[PDB]
């Protein structure tokens with residue numbers, strides 16, 4: 036579809052009646068270090084991606100019943116589960132995380148995060164991109180649209196989190212590798228992954244129910260959680276609704292991630308350990324995932340100005356999304 040100017044994009048933003056909506060107030064504002072045991076996390080594991088890691092197709096649990104790959108799947112799963120028992124027992128892989136909730140308001144395509152409820156001092160800004168193609172009856176989405184504009188005078192909030200399956204991940208895989216045991220070496224990385232992702236599901240649930248607290252009586256099964264049948268979203272930088280990776284640096288700063296979990300970001304803004312998940316929390320009932328997709332040169336120059344970066348640095352990071360021939 037033909038791109039649109041940034042201005043026409045911004046003119047077709049998410050239309051909602053803010054004067055008639057009262058965003059839910061965050062019950063626990065602030066930053067809180069969190070933890071979760073392997074035992075608790077196992078109830079939140081989505082196993083389908085583990086089987087796909089072992090090049091097996093099929094969705095858990097039906098996959099355990101496949102007359103051809105069923106038996107290999109059952110072996111994998113049994114070994115998966117005995118290793119979990121062992122890391123659980125020996126406390127050798129320890130999931131760590133941090134979560135935070137903040138007063139926030141939308142100004143343009145960005146989200147201002149305030150030091151407190153007087154909302155007079157911006158401690159950080161969460162920058163976002165807006166879809167830049169001609170949209171038919173649908174707004175040109177930007178994640179900032181799901182937070183109340185500062186102009187509406189409504190108090191709103193945003194949350195963030197960073198979780199890891201454990202800082203031991205490499206020590207464990209490194210040891211399986213030294214003795215040429217690539218099976219378990221894969222096994223331990225595949226599990227740390229499931230655990231990181233389980234912790235993100237579990238923590239999002241605690242946020243919906245207690246920390247932000249807008250859905251205190253929520254009672255979803257793990258399959259309902261996997262189907263995302265809850266109110267709200269937890270977009271992660273790097274994913275399609277927010278493809279710009281350097282924003283992981285804002286989360287690291289807001290939650291003081293390294294100080295509270297030992298998790299670090301690299302030169303290309305990847306997270307260490309490898310089994311880690313970071314992102315934002317949005318409470319709006321209408322929030323959803325989508326792809327920003329191809330963005331034009333006017334959006335790149337504006338984004339660079341807001342971020343305080345040169346247009347070429349922004350070109351490096353948004354390269355998969357430039358809707359024009361970059362250089």
Ligand SMILES: C[S@@+](CC[C@H](N)C(=O)[O-])C[C@H]1O[C@@H](n2cnc3c(N)ncnc32)[C@H](O)[C@@H]1O
Nearest residue numbers: 081084232261269270271274275276277324325
């Ligand atoms: C990666 S899966 C994780 C849950 C799944 N059951 C699993 O275990 O893999 C879905 C997650 O990816 C991120 N995500 C997916 N689509 C996204 C989008 N379009 N924009 C931003 N983040 C997105 C969100 O953090 C979301 O919770």
